[PDB]
Amino acid sequence: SKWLEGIRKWYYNAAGFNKLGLMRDDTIYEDDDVKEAIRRLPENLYNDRVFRIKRALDLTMRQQILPKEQWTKYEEDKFYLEPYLKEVIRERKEREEWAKK
Amino acid sequence: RHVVCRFPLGPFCAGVVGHAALPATSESPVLDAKRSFLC
């Protein structure tokens, strides 16, 4: 319940990708399914993701962190990529299930 | 009789082959039936 929410928020703060302005779905490993999901993103979301990732890379190059008020809040972190990734994974699972028989 | 196939020649003027998906189009009665014979 609220205990799980508290530990999840603590972990989100500890995993400092919000300190770089990134969102959770910007840090996922770009395997084949994630690449296909990115390919299906609408143009605005793709551009926003590209800029956020580039800014994070610049910050890590300078070994610096975004101002405290610019960190991505846990409650306002939107999982934009999750639906597309889920759809791609379902399609892959369907293809594999067909291949089994 | 109400198809665009008023005369059999002409309709099906252009239609692509296919399996499980094969679009086709139908213009109206046209020529190029005996065109091949002459030359």
Binding site: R39, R40, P42, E91, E94, R95, W98 | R1, H2, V3, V4, C5, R6, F7, P8, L9, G10, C13, A14, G15, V16, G18, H19, A20, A21, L22, P23, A24, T25, S26, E27, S28, P29, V30, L31, D32, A33, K34, R35, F37, L38, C39
Partner: protein, 418 residues
């Protein structure tokens, strides 16, 4: 047995014939097509025709393709300027599955952005393949020249619209034209109760006549292509009649008087009045025939000729003169009887194939209200008199004419010169 007809309360037509054939073929004829596009969404019907295998709310693209192929069935889309037919063919033991796919494709599409964007190039590929033969482009230009509002729209997406057909346009077109009243579910090798049940299951939604198409207006212009080919294809038509009416039968009999089909392979087209009329004047390889298009709003009757670039004009003149000869009352009764026999035999052979019979029944259910037996159609053809054919020829001669040519065009006449 006998074809069974039904009109559901929402307006959907259902026709079922049980010929006990090993293969069942089910079509869904929707009163969509190019004529129901406007200037802002040209080519939408082309992408819709190409997008039968895309993902639907019920089944995915992969599922649709694999499931249809597994039972060896075929899913096809045939689109004219006033109708789109989605037909599924397979062995009768496994028809229900295909029906679901069919009734998904036309009732719960999704038009996912990435799928449509991938499909865009297929528009150009299909257009190029179709235009590989000159008749397609010549007839597209002929419809563009003859009509101005609705039927002028081409069966193929315009070049500037290849990458611009958005999923929203496809959704709007489907929601406004794939309606219950605009649909008819025909089936060969199926029982009426099953067809009715599946229609209730899927085609219950999207009722009403849908978005109404604008009445076709006759332009009477001309379009010249100038593609530099040795052979010139020239079509010269005039507003003939609407399908179904007695004028349509008169124009059909007139077309078979002039001579449409080749009949005897490598033949001199002796019965074909146009071919023999042109032959005595032009000795180069030409080939000519009579064009006859019938639509709900209007129709176009005329002469379609192929000719050598140098002599093309002469050919057209000769052909035109021949029709004038018919228009002046020079029409033998034996010629009319032979044309009626040819028309009746051609119609009977058209509905011989399951494809032809299904398309005929779908067109009758969509344009008309019920299905008319072939005997009544033959009676209508017989009722046509010589005076009616002469009047049709007179109407073609007098009416303002639209022309479309493609070739060298150095010696091809203009409409005014005809």
């Amino acid at each position: 047995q006998d074809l069974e007809f039904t009109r559901l309360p929402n307006g959907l037509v259902i026709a079922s014939l049980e010929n006990y054939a090993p293969a069942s073929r089910i079509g869904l004829f929707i009163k969509a097509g190019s004529r129901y596009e406007d200037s802002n969404n040209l080519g939408t019907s082309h992408l819709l025709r190409l997008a039968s295998s895309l993902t639907t709310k019920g089944a995915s693209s992969f599922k649709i393709t694999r499931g249809i192929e597994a039972v060896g069935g075929k899913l096809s889309v045939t689109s004219t300027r006033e109708s789109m037919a989605y037909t599924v063919e397979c062995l009768r033991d496994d028809i229900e599955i295909l029906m679901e796919f069919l009734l998904n494709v036309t009732a719960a599409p999704e038009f996912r952005r990435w799928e449509v964007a991938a499909l865009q190039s297929q528009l150009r590929i299909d257009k190029a393949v179709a235009f590989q033969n000159p008749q397609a482009q010549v007839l597209e230009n002929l419809h563009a020249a003859a009509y101005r509002n609705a039927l002028a729209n081409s069966l193929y997406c315009p070049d500037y619209r290849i990458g611009k057909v958005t999923p929203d346009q496809l959704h709007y077109y489907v929601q406004n034209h794939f309606t219950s009243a605009r649909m008819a579910l025909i089936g060969l090798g199926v029982s009426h109760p099953v067809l009715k049940q599946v229609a209730e299951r899927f085609l219950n939604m999207r009722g009403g006549l849908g978005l109404s198409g604008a009445k076709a207006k006759y332009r009477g212009g001309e379009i010249r292509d100038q593609n530099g080919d040795s052979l010139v294809h020239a079509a010269l038509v005039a507003e003939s009649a609407a399908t179904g009416s007695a004028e349509a039968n008169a124009f059909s009999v007139l077309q078979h008087v002039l001579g449409a089909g080749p009949h005897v392979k490598r033949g001199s087209n002796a019965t074909s009045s146009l071919y023999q009329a042109v032959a005595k004047g032009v000795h180069q390889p030409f080939d000519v025939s009579a064009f006859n298009a019938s639509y709900s709003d209007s129709g176009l009757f005329g002469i379609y000729t192929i000719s050598q670039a140098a002599s093309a004009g002469d050919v057209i003149k000769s052909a035109y003169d021949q029709v004038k000869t018919i228009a002046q009352g020079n029409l033998s009764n034996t010629d009319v009887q032979a044309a009626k026999n040819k028309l009746k035999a051609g119609y009977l052979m058209s509905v011989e194939s399951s494809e032809g019979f299904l398309d005929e029944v779908g067109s009758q259910a969509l344009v008309a209200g019920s299905y008319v037996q072939p005997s009544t159609v033959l009676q209508q053809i017989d009722s046509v008199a010589d005076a009616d054919v002469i009047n049709a020829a007179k109407k073609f001669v007098s009416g303002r004419k639209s022309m479309a040519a493609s070739g060298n065009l150095g010696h091809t006449p203009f409409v005014d010169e005809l």
